[PDB]
Amino acid sequence: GLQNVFQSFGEMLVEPSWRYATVKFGEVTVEKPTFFSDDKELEFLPWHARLQ
Amino acid sequence: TYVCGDCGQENTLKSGDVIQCRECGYRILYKKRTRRVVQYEA
Ligand SMILES: [Zn+2]
Numbered sequence: 001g002l003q004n005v006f007q008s009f010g011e012m013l014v015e016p017s018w019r020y021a022t023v024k025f026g027e028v029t030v031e032k033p034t035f036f037s038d039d040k041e042l043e044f045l046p047w048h049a050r051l052q
Numbered sequence: 053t054y055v056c057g058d059c060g061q062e063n064t065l066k067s068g069d070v071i072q073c074r075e076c077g078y079r080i081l082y083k084k085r086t087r088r089v090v091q092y093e094a
Contacts, residue, residue, distance in 0.1 A: 037072075037077045037078075037079075038072070039077045040077065042077050042078065048078070048080065051080050052079065052080065
């Protein structure tokens with residue numbers, strides 16, 4: 001679903017009014033959930049989120 | 053005395069900022085039950 005959604009959207013050229021800016025989106029990747037603790041990365045579980 | 057979560061360790065921390073377990077990293081603590089006599093009516 002996400003890949004089709006991002007592929008469907010098309011970014012046209014950006015011109016304030018020669019130089020021009022264009023942006024493109026590549027392959028979309030989603031990583032597994034993780035907790036960014038102060039010490040180091042830790043395993044994240046649904047009950048941890050529920051309690052915290 | 054407070055018990056940690058997935059790790060078995062007594063934090064015994066009373067500071068306001070001390071909420072994170074020592075050498076564990078998780079921030080979930082359970083209050084420990086002391087030896088107190090309580091009466092119940094059966
Ligand atoms: Zn711990």
